[PDB]
RNA sequence: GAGCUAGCCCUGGCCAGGGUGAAGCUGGGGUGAGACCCAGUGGAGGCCCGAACCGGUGGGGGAUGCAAACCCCUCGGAUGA
RNA sequence: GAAUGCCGGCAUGAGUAACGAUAAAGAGGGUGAGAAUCCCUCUCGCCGUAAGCCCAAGGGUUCCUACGCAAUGGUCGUCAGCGUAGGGUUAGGCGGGACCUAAGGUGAAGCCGAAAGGCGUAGCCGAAGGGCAGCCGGUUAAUAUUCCGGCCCUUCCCGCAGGUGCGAUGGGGGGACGCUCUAGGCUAGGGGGACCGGAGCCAUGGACGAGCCCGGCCAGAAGCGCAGGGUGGGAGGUAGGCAAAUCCGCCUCCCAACAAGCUCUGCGUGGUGGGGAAGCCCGGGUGACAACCCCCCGAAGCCAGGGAGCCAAGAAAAGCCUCUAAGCACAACCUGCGGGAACCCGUACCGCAAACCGACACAGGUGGGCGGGUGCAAGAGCACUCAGGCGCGCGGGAGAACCCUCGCCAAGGAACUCUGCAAGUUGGCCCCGUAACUUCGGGAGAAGGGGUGCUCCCUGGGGUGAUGAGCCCCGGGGAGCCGCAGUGAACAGGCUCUGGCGACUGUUUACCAAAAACACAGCUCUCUGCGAACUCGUAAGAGGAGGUAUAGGGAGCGACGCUUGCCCGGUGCCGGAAGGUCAAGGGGAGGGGUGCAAGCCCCGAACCGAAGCCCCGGUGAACGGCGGCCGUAACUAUAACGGUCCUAAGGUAGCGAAAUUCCUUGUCGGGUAAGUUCCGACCUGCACGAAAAGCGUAACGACCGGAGCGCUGUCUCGGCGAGGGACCCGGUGAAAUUGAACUGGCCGUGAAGAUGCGGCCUACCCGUGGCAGGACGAAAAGACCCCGUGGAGCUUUACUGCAGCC
RNA sequence: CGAUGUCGGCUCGUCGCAUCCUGGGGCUGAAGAAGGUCCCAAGGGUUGGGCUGUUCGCCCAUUAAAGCGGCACGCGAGCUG
RNA sequence: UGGGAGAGGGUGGUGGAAUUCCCGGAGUAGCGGUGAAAUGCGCAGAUACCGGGAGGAACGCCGAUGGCGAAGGCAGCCACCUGGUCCACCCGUGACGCUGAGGCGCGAAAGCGUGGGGAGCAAACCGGAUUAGAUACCCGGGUAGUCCACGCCCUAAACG
RNA sequence: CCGAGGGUAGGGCCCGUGACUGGGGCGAAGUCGUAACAAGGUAGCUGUACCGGAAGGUGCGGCUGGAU
């Protein structure tokens, strides 16, 4: 569920917040957080290269285990579910009978004090990680690597998931969160289940101030600018676009496809995104 | 009202000082020119 | 040249007093169970009044100025973008 | 002799403006050649969340003393932040370094770039963050946590004794963290005392008194006491913490568990060392063997790494602890004790300002801490006042106009004006009470009204004590008293009705615009499968993101409610293995130059040969577009209806003389005595219309219209009064401007608006206070306008390039 | 064009007369009273409101009357904006 | 107490046919549609046929004039959870009953909100026809919706 | 002290009236088309939704009060 407020300010009328119900630990494991070097959208030349960034709440980066084939065979107990400010999904503290402690991203249904394991031999149960070639056809799955041993890269945000669709030799056919149908190497690891915190999308920021807490500086329309700034600049009074709608740098921004048509991965993408 | 000159010794030495000029090709040319003109002060004197 | 100014980054600091009284909690009523209702507790909020502090609304003064943007009266924000 | 020339000198305006906050002065005494201005005393006024004290920047001797007054000081000067000379700044513990890391910077390895240079994990540098051992008093003309005194403490070295597997840049723990609210107990600070100490005082009608006035503490090791912080103990197994490990992490059993225990801090006490008022004696002396005690209030500070709740989820590294590795175990470390040793730099002074930033001793600007008392409900607000500091470096008169800032006003009450601009009114707190509409929060301090001082009597609970008195806090109910008036002074909303625009708090043209503009949650389209798209860079490399489609980029729209129609012919975008056009290149029919030759060289047809365009289709919250004519109904009028030309298709719902309406003050209705504005309608909409969104909408607004009530010098219509100026005398003394001037009116003339020409009229010479009609008055080589084959910003289906992309 | 500030208002006036009123007249289709129309006459007078920036105009309530023009569409080194 | 019949209801799982789309093959001049046609689709390789795949909705035969439910309404199969109802024994209770203004709950379809999902169908719409005209009936397209979750809506020829 | 009432302020109910506007009833001698009663020439009716000059149409589900 999502927490509404009585309208005792103009902004509380619409503000909604997560209920944080799955959370069992309000402090992060000390040996798994490191400082997160806030950038403000500036790069090593100090120049803004991503606009309208900066000024949000201080964060510590929680080290997430995006490999898990790291420790095949070693079971682990789900000791906690925690709040990570660096991602939409929730994180789960794992206590490996090994003694080691790691964070995975918390799947839907993951239970405090359940056991999970990685490997070709793991059961097909929520929180376990296997190479794709051993997960059966049809199961939904998250934390998916794109290439073997390079780390989980697909289906990582709250609520998302991918579904196995069948085997074609060394490769499995996935349906990504976007609807794209892609081949992925069978030795790529994934984790059975979908990502948790699926109510994430239903959250209503409510006020400009909420966006600022998130480090989102206000976005300003090109139509509000001058010709030295933006193709949509100028005009006396309000002005329609008077040209195909365009970015601050001139390229067209309604429909113009932008993936490179010679990119070598094209040989592995079966069907483009649908919606 | 708040004027333009707000003295600050660390800023002065760190921006115009001798070790800042010697860093860059531009800064050395500054020193070369001011030595060629016979300037008594190569660089702003800041108390330290 | 960013010791003015604009943004961001790191690290510190500041915000008298008063008012309103959200959720939750407890008690009671209610019901098959509930919803919900009433009182108490409670202390939320780009919440209210108002100094510091940040502003610069209207008028008046000033106009070889006290001042190359100031002064008086008034007025905006003041836990938050 | 002119260039609004250049440099310099000196004029004119002129004894003119001004002499920099309207907090304020008066007298006596002294010094001196000279005194409103220096020193001293008395009186007066002003700041007191400062206009007082301390600190950090910045300044760099401005500090202290002696001598001095040319210049500096807006006057004066005997004085001074000025001239000269001499003196003055003392640290193991305060601050920085011989410690740590932050962003950032630099940068072994490594990567990139014509060069110069650009990056770059580790490392290093980098603080006002972490860390680390001194408190009180005394002393100097001037330094003091630095010197001295009293009492404490830190590290390094060496030695002794006891103890221990010692040992690290390696492993681990810890350091280590947000916001808001908050408990307990303390301390800083404060108030009272009929109690303790104290020089005195009795006035002018009364008082020799529970009289007045003054003061009644500070630091302190170990112990102890009080309050708090932190921390489970034992054994076994152990595959993880890039070696090892007894440490830590993980599993299991036992015991203890809101306890105590061990530990740490705070406060109190504490051997001891200090301090010590008024008053009157010439900073010092006495007071004084000063006393140094009780009660209340009480922090935002302390215990502290406390507690709760919340979402936006809140640095690092070292010091420290623990673990082991080599090694070494005659060492080494731990603990106690003892002697020795303990470096470099800062320290004066100003510091909300006459010493800093503003050219000035400039009404401006400048970060942190302390900031007393009484009353007003509270408070850092307001009034007065303590401590401390000042009266703002020109004065003395006068009592015009006029200006400024201020007070009041008969009768009227917005009649003022573009506008109630401005100024009145209202104004705190307590009680009563309170409408449309509403998103059920509000609107709301709605509106409106009553209370408010003091005295006596009775009385209810709380805090501290003890349960009581005392103090202190929140009350209640009667009875009276006085004045024009009881938040008696100061600080402190005028209100209502109704349209427009923007949902809202926010942001903006530093220095003419604060808005209806920007932003904003939210909505939609669209791009992006991760070495993402996109952005910066030649590149390396970065951001994006240590993120992964519930994500990131781009665009429009802009809470919310109800909605968002038709047109894909043109442009854009997207899809389309056909076809057409298509460059290099391929291919070489055929043709040429030359050579005696083999040969060399050159041209060149069909055919093959990409993207792009052309072609087919899709696509509107993509660019954009959304008609005209004729005729027809029992009376006129009009046209549901029929016809026809055109188009890609002819504007749907809603709204409409509107932030849009030309005609226009449309017409009708409302309000008014009267209404080019306002509201409500109508619809021939010059020229609304659905995300450059359409129509509404509670709440909000220093936004812009219209009206009413309250109240007013806004006005009829002005009068008086106050202070700072203006005026006069003494001191000091500018400015732009200036062809030269011995510079009147009229009517004419004149390059067409004459002091300067003609005629006539008028007029003795020279100033002071005033007013602004002229000198086409001053200022600025007109911003409008044109001209120049002048410039620059911006646009695009102008031309031609380039990056980028294919 | 090395600048001649530009509408309206407010303030202060001053002038012309082709006269709105008051005074003097002739003609009348002047009975009276009231008008019409021309002549002489510039001495004085020529109101307060609603609307709009407005000039002008219209309207309200009055009036003897509510005149029309010039003075750089009089007057910004006088004000307003 | 002991038995029975049933599309009664809720949650989850799950099986086959068909429709559409995408891919591979093979193949060629039409297909589709109607009362007759045209729009449409198709030499850029359709229709018809074979292989593979994805996805949604509905449940052929059984199926009947049948069964169940208070009504609305309920249909592949499996399990769990749960309601009502009939029978036989005549064992227990001892009039504990009938109705029911108010209240509360349920309430087909369409419609609304938030989010999913979207094959087939199909308001609005666009185009072809038909026709005197044809904003319709017929044809080719086509968006909501139809489906899932949760929250509203509370209507009916909600009828026997 | 209470007190007729008067005064200020803010509320509730009722009535009359209003530029303009919504449909209703009646009028009948008009214009348009022909929705329903026959299978009424697309069986009708229906709740609802969307749309159309008008009657009405269409979708989804329901009824028979439907001819053959
Ligand atoms: Mg809410
Ligand atoms: Mg709430
Ligand atoms: Mg709630
Ligand atoms: Mg709101
Ligand atoms: Mg509100
Ligand atoms: Mg919550
Ligand atoms: Mg959660
Ligand atoms: Mg935390
Ligand atoms: Mg760490
Ligand atoms: Mg990181
Ligand atoms: Mg980062
Ligand atoms: Mg860097
Ligand atoms: Mg930048
Ligand atoms: Mg960007
Ligand atoms: Mg940015
Ligand atoms: Mg942030
Ligand atoms: Mg999270
Ligand atoms: Mg392979
Ligand atoms: Mg959850
Ligand atoms: Mg969430
Ligand atoms: Mg969001
Ligand atoms: Mg955004
Ligand atoms: Mg924007
Ligand atoms: Mg602009
Ligand atoms: Mg620029
Ligand atoms: Mg450009
Ligand atoms: Mg441009
Ligand atoms: Mg434009
Ligand atoms: Mg334009
Ligand atoms: Mg514009
Ligand atoms: Mg425009
Ligand atoms: Mg604009
Ligand atoms: Mg614009
Ligand atoms: Mg705009
Ligand atoms: Mg607009
Ligand atoms: Mg335009
Ligand atoms: Mg546009
Ligand atoms: Mg255009
Ligand atoms: Mg790949
Ligand atoms: Mg500064
Ligand atoms: Mg400095
Ligand atoms: Mg510094
Ligand atoms: Mg600096
Ligand atoms: Mg330097
Ligand atoms: Mg020099
Ligand atoms: Mg020299
Ligand atoms: Mg230099
Ligand atoms: Mg700066
Ligand atoms: Mg910080
Ligand atoms: Mg504050
Ligand atoms: Mg309360
Ligand atoms: Mg609670
Ligand atoms: Mg507020
Ligand atoms: Mg607030
Ligand atoms: Mg300011
Ligand atoms: Mg102002
Ligand atoms: Mg004012
Ligand atoms: Mg004034
Ligand atoms: Mg002025
Ligand atoms: Mg000026
Ligand atoms: Mg001021
Ligand atoms: Mg002021
Ligand atoms: Mg104020
Ligand atoms: Mg306020
Ligand atoms: Mg406040
Ligand atoms: Mg607050
Ligand atoms: Mg705020
Ligand atoms: Mg903040
Ligand atoms: Mg000459
Ligand atoms: Mg000159
Ligand atoms: Mg000159
Ligand atoms: Mg000159
Ligand atoms: Mg010169
Ligand atoms: Mg003069
Ligand atoms: Mg001056
Ligand atoms: Mg002055
Ligand atoms: Mg004053
Ligand atoms: Mg003197
Ligand atoms: Mg003298
Ligand atoms: Mg003196
Ligand atoms: Mg005080
Ligand atoms: Mg200086
Ligand atoms: Mg000196
Ligand atoms: Mg000194
Ligand atoms: Mg002198
Ligand atoms: Mg002198
Ligand atoms: Mg002298
Ligand atoms: Mg001088
Ligand atoms: Mg001076
Ligand atoms: Mg002397
Ligand atoms: Mg001086
Ligand atoms: Mg000396
Ligand atoms: Mg010492
Ligand atoms: Mg050393
Ligand atoms: Mg370091
Ligand atoms: Mg350092
Ligand atoms: Mg430091
Ligand atoms: Mg220190
Ligand atoms: Mg001490
Ligand atoms: Mg000294
Ligand atoms: Mg941390
Ligand atoms: Mg800290
Ligand atoms: Mg905060
Ligand atoms: Mg006190
Ligand atoms: Mg005290
Ligand atoms: Mg007493
Ligand atoms: Mg205690
Ligand atoms: Mg081990
Ligand atoms: Mg003494
Ligand atoms: Mg003595
Ligand atoms: Mg004694
Ligand atoms: Mg506080
Ligand atoms: Mg805590
Ligand atoms: Mg959150
Ligand atoms: Mg670090
Ligand atoms: Mg030991
Ligand atoms: Mg040394
Ligand atoms: Mg030194
Ligand atoms: Mg010192
Ligand atoms: Mg100040
Ligand atoms: Mg200060
Ligand atoms: Mg001074
Ligand atoms: Mg100075
Ligand atoms: Mg001065
Ligand atoms: Mg000053
Ligand atoms: Mg004090
Ligand atoms: Mg008060
Ligand atoms: Mg008060
Ligand atoms: Mg105040
Ligand atoms: Mg006092
Ligand atoms: Mg004075
Ligand atoms: Mg005088
Ligand atoms: Mg009066
Ligand atoms: Mg009035
Ligand atoms: Mg009145
Ligand atoms: Mg007005
Ligand atoms: Mg007041
Ligand atoms: Mg009302
Ligand atoms: Mg309400
Ligand atoms: Mg009131
Ligand atoms: Mg009294
Ligand atoms: Mg106490
Ligand atoms: Mg009084
Ligand atoms: Mg005052
Ligand atoms: Mg107020
Ligand atoms: Mg007012
Ligand atoms: Mg109102
Ligand atoms: Mg609006
Ligand atoms: Mg606004
Ligand atoms: Mg705005
Ligand atoms: Mg908005
Ligand atoms: Mg806003
Ligand atoms: Mg605010
Ligand atoms: Mg401005
Ligand atoms: Mg400006
Ligand atoms: Mg400017
Ligand atoms: Mg400027
Ligand atoms: Mg201004
Ligand atoms: Mg502005
Ligand atoms: Mg504003
Ligand atoms: Mg703006
Ligand atoms: Mg905006
Ligand atoms: Mg929206
Ligand atoms: Mg670039
Ligand atoms: Mg890189
Ligand atoms: Mg990164
Ligand atoms: Mg991302
Ligand atoms: Mg905007
Ligand atoms: Mg909006
Ligand atoms: Mg509504
Ligand atoms: Mg088109
Ligand atoms: Mg097109
Ligand atoms: Mg075009
Ligand atoms: Mg040949
Ligand atoms: Mg659309
Ligand atoms: Mg067009
Ligand atoms: Mg458009
Ligand atoms: Mg139109
Ligand atoms: Mg249409
Ligand atoms: Mg109209
Ligand atoms: Mg009108
Ligand atoms: Mg309108
Ligand atoms: Mg228009
Ligand atoms: Mg026009
Ligand atoms: Mg008009
Ligand atoms: Mg007009
Ligand atoms: Mg009119
Ligand atoms: Mg008219
Ligand atoms: Mg108006
Ligand atoms: Mg107007
Ligand atoms: Mg009309
Ligand atoms: Mg636009
Ligand atoms: Mg506003
Ligand atoms: Mg405003
Ligand atoms: Mg006056
Ligand atoms: Mg007076
Ligand atoms: Mg006076
Ligand atoms: Mg005065
Ligand atoms: Mg006076
Ligand atoms: Mg005289
Ligand atoms: Mg002469
Ligand atoms: Mg003349
Ligand atoms: Mg003359
Ligand atoms: Mg002459
Ligand atoms: Mg002459
Ligand atoms: Mg002559
Ligand atoms: Mg002459
Ligand atoms: Mg004359
Ligand atoms: Mg003059
Ligand atoms: Mg004058
Ligand atoms: Mg002249
Ligand atoms: Mg002139
Ligand atoms: Mg010029
Ligand atoms: Mg020039
Ligand atoms: Mg010129
Ligand atoms: Mg010019
Ligand atoms: Mg011209
Ligand atoms: Mg030319
Ligand atoms: Mg030419
Ligand atoms: Mg150019
Ligand atoms: Mg240029
Ligand atoms: Mg591109
Ligand atoms: Mg000119
Ligand atoms: Mg000139
Ligand atoms: Mg000029
Ligand atoms: Mg006359
Ligand atoms: Mg007669
Ligand atoms: Mg005559
Ligand atoms: Mg006259
Ligand atoms: Mg005259
Ligand atoms: Mg007018
Ligand atoms: Mg005019
Ligand atoms: Mg007019
Ligand atoms: Mg009359
Ligand atoms: Mg008359
Ligand atoms: Mg005139
Ligand atoms: Mg004219
Ligand atoms: Mg003219
Ligand atoms: Mg004029
Ligand atoms: Mg002017
Ligand atoms: Mg004017
Ligand atoms: Mg004028
Ligand atoms: Mg002038
Ligand atoms: Mg003048
Ligand atoms: Mg003049
Ligand atoms: Mg203006
Ligand atoms: Mg072919
Ligand atoms: Mg059947
Ligand atoms: Mg009932
Ligand atoms: Mg229903
Ligand atoms: Mg629906
Ligand atoms: Mg579909
Ligand atoms: Mg037709
Ligand atoms: Mg629809
Ligand atoms: Mg919809
Ligand atoms: Mg039936
Ligand atoms: Mg009465
Ligand atoms: Mg009476
Ligand atoms: Mg029909
Ligand atoms: Mg019919
Ligand atoms: Mg029919
Ligand atoms: Mg219609
Ligand atoms: Mg029609
Ligand atoms: Mg239809
Ligand atoms: Mg039925």
Curated annotation (Swiss-Prot), chain A:
GO cellular component: large ribosomal subunit
SMART domains, alphabetized: Ribosomal_L2 (SM01383), Ribosomal_L2_C (SM01382)
Compositional bias of kind Basic and acidic residues: 229-239
InterPro entries membership: NA-bd_OB-fold, Rib_uL2_dom2, Ribosomal_uL2, Ribosomal_uL2_bac/org-type, Ribosomal_uL2_C, Ribosomal_uL2_CS, Ribosomal_uL2_dom3, Ribosomal_uL2_RNA-bd_dom
Composition skew (Basic residues), residue ranges: 256-275
Start and end residues of each stretch annotated as Disordered: 222-275
GO biological process terms held by the UniProt record: cytoplasmic translation
Organism superkingdom: Bacteria
Gene3D superfamilies, per the entry: 2.30.30.30, Nucleic acid-binding proteins, Ribosomal protein L2, domain 3
Protein's UniProt keywords contain RNA-binding: yes
GO MF: rRNA binding; structural constituent of ribosome; transferase activity
Keyword tags: Ribonucleoprotein, Ribosomal protein, RNA-binding, rRNA-binding
Subunit structure: Part of the 50S ribosomal subunit. Forms a bridge to the 30S subunit in the 70S ribosome, contacting the 16S rRNA. May also make transient contacts with protein S6 during translation in the 70S ribosome.
Reported function: One of the primary rRNA binding proteins. Required for association of the 30S and 50S subunits to form the 70S ribosome, for tRNA binding and peptide bond formation. It has been suggested to have peptidyltransferase activity; this is somewhat controversial. Makes several contacts with the 16S rRNA (forming bridge B7b) in the 70S ribosome.
PANTHER family recorded: LARGE RIBOSOMAL SUBUNIT PROTEIN UL2M, RIBOSOMAL PROTEIN L2
Protein family membership: Belongs to the universal ribosomal protein uL2 family.
Protein name per its UniProtKB record: Large ribosomal subunit protein uL2
Curated annotation (Swiss-Prot), chain B:
Keyword Ribosomal protein included in the entry's annotation: yes
One GO term describing the cellular component: ribosome
A molecular function (GO) term: structural constituent of ribosome
Tree of life domain: Bacteria
Disordered as annotated region, ranges: 26-48
Leader sequence residues: none
Cited Pfam families: Ribosomal_L34
GO BP field: translation
InterPro entries per UniProt: Ribosomal_bL34 (IPR000271), Ribosomal_bL34_CS (IPR020939)
Keyword field: Ribonucleoprotein, Ribosomal protein
Residue ranges with Basic residues bias: 29-48
Transmembrane segments annotated in the record for this chain: none
Family according to the record: Belongs to the bacterial ribosomal protein bL34 family.
HAMAP family from the UniProt entry: Ribosomal_bL34
Function: Found on the solvent side of the large subunit.
Self-association state and partner proteins as the record states: Part of the 50S ribosomal subunit.
Miscellaneous field: The open reading frame (ORF) for this protein is entirely within the ORF for the RNase P protein (RnaP). The two start codons are separated by four nucleotides.
Protein name per Swiss-Prot or TrEMBL: Large ribosomal subunit protein bL34
Organism of provenance: Thermus thermophilus (strain ATCC 27634 / DSM 579 / HB8)
Gene that specifies this protein: rpmH
